[PDB]
């Protein structure tokens, strides 16, 4: 019963330490992904913010040229 | 932040540098931030002799003083030019304290990191300046363009790059360096009509030559109608006699050099053209966005005033990329100011103070942060 | 929880948790301890407790534990649980021992004892592999089949890094180099570490340096004389694959390998050859790893695929994989108790760990 007791034991050990070992990968990976997505995130808010910034000009720029050049200037 | 204050806008261009004040649509006074210096110092003892020559000193003299570019491949090769260039700058042109004012500095694609924690150390300790943000000079130029989907073709004056854009996804991995812009074409031009006879080697002349091509030189359609057009008829050639008294005849050159831009087979070397290399860019898009990619392709740049190039762009999407999908090239006039229009309009702003770095977080995450935050 | 690896020449402390050890310092006493001793040699006599892997004096080992807690770690033992290693084939004798002491003369609150090259494999990995420690006083070749070494199969060879030493210090001194003291070995182990490779073809390398002087190299003396070494620099190193340049009879690591993949079970070769990985400081040499490759695919049928695992960091592999094995939480329930111990006496050792 020892023996049998001891290669069950050892057979855990090691299948927990690669699975210890792969969760890391996991983690890492999974990690400069989202750090990577959040770079795609970031540097396109400031597109949205342009956009939307050209929308509001050409939006007032529209109701300027209205009411015939607002009463001719 | 406060709307009295304006924050200093410098962006450091191949062939030029611009200067102004946010709220202006235009910029004010342009000035290349180049440093000129004598091939030889200790010549010119006596008449007020200087380390370092910026703006108009260097410009007056420019016929005796060789022209260096301090960026070579948006590398730095000398901190203490820019660091010169940015004292006087403040102290002298402006008359401004970067310490009262905040500063936006730009920086070329594919900047290694080391170079970037050295900027940042360097203007955040001898400075001291509160915040720090960059910007890459290409997305910037395509925003104020006013569309955020299409790909940036920018055959610069030193180096040649493309940056495809995704509404906003700027795509590093995507953005392709290539050695070869208009430095490398135009020095074939010297050397061609060097052996052709034709000696030019003061800066002066270089510059003269530089400006007849801007203001004469057209980018050629049909290259078979200009050949028809020459053999024909002589009224677009012109014999122009320098200042000096120099008697110069130009020929062929003179619309062989827009050919060589977009064709450089004339200088028999095997090597992939700026139009392939774009071309290669695209390819490494996804498929699909391919199709609004090309429907929304934008010219820009700082060293793109060639006129006619639109026109070439024009015939070269319609022969590679299929005719039955609606093509506009939008090319405004202030495309060379885009970059300059794209960080006033960023300096303009009061709610992105929070996505400028404060001095807290700058001092609590080391200069790294701005690898994090600034793209 | 406390990790040492009280290897033959080096010992390597530090806590569990950590990428790499905290403290490393010579396995010697004098009862000044490690660099102390090593500096101080003109005052008391230098002395090893291990040797061959082998614990030969309990009275000195108690003092290395001592420095090494009390001094290089600065912890008190009392307060940690304290994980040891032991070289394989072990006498059971000496396991009883290292508890007894540190249950009763350091006060452990628990501890456990576990084999070398079985934390290597941790280190590397593997669940099933057959693992090359190859140290400075011992080499040995243990195969390991989920997780459970087959003592059977255990192979030790006794040619590690001194032996290396000693045969350096000889042909230097047959170019012509006089190297004979212990302060003269360091100076020799230096170079070793610093020059020595493996060749992949020793007869080619041998020609090549001798119809020219690509493969030489200049080396600086702590007293500043220059000088160069040329054949030297490969002919050490394959003293491992051919002992009988010092006088041995007795096979290479290679064979040594080979042998004791042929003393296990057929099922399981084909996993031992694809997970054959190295460790320990003698392995650190360039080129090892592709002789190691190329020899035994030249003994081993063309069937088997085999591959070599060296990591970058093999030297303290021993030490990364007590600190894998100590920070697990599957591993808690395996520690000997201070009540086990006064209930049990020092065979609960053999109960617990393996």
Known sequence: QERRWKVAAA????????????????????????????LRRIAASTAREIECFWS?????????????????? | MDDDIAALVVDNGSGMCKAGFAGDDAPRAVFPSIVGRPRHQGVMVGMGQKDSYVGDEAQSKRGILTLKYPIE??????????????????????????????????????????????????????????AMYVAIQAVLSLYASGRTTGIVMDSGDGVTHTVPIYEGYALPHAILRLDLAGRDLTDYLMKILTERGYSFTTTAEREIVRDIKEKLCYV?????????????????????????????????????????????????????????????????????????????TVLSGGTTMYPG?????????????????????????????????????????????????????????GPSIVHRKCF
């Not at chain 1, 000009?57 to 050049?69: A, D, F, N, P, S």
């Not at chain 2, 014999?239 to 050919?259: A, H, K, M, W």
């Not at chain 2, 039955?324 to 009061?350: H, N």
């Open chain 2, 73 to 130: 491949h948006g590398i730095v090769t000398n901190w203490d030019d820019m660091e010169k260039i940015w004292h006087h700058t403040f102290y002298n042109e402006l008359r401004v304290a970067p310490e009262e004012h905040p500063v936006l500095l730009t920086e070329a694609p594919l900047n290694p990191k080391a170079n970037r924690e050295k900027m940042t150390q360097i203007m955040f300790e001898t400075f001291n300046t509160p």
């Open chain 2, 309 to 365: 190039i639109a026109d070439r762009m024009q015939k070269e999407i319609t022969a590679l990329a299929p005719s039955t999908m609606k093509i506009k090239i939008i090319a405004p006039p202030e495309r060379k100011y885009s970059v300059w229009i794209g960080g006033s309009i960023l300096a303009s702003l009061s709610t992105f103070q929070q996505m400028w770095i404060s001095k807290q977080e700058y001092d609590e995450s």
């Open chain 1, 11 to 38: 057979k855990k050990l090691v299948r927990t330490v690669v699975r210890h070992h792969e969760e890391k990968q996991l983690r890492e990976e999974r990690g400069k992904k989202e750090e990577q997505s959040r």
């Open chain 1, 56 to 73: 509001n000009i050409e939006q007032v720029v529209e109701i300027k040229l209205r009411v015939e050049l607002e009463e001719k200037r």
């Open chain 2, 220 to 296: 050629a359609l049909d290259f078979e109608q200009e050949m028809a057009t020459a053999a024909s008829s002589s009224s677009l050639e012109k014999s122009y006699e320098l200042p000096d008294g120099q008697v110069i005849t130009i020929g062929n050159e003179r619309f062989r050099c827009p050919e060589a831009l977009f064709q450089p087979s004339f200088l028999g070397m095997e090597s992939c053209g700026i139009h392939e290399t774009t071309f290669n860019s695209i390819m490494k898009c996804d498929v699909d966005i391919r199709k609004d990619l090309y429907a929304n």
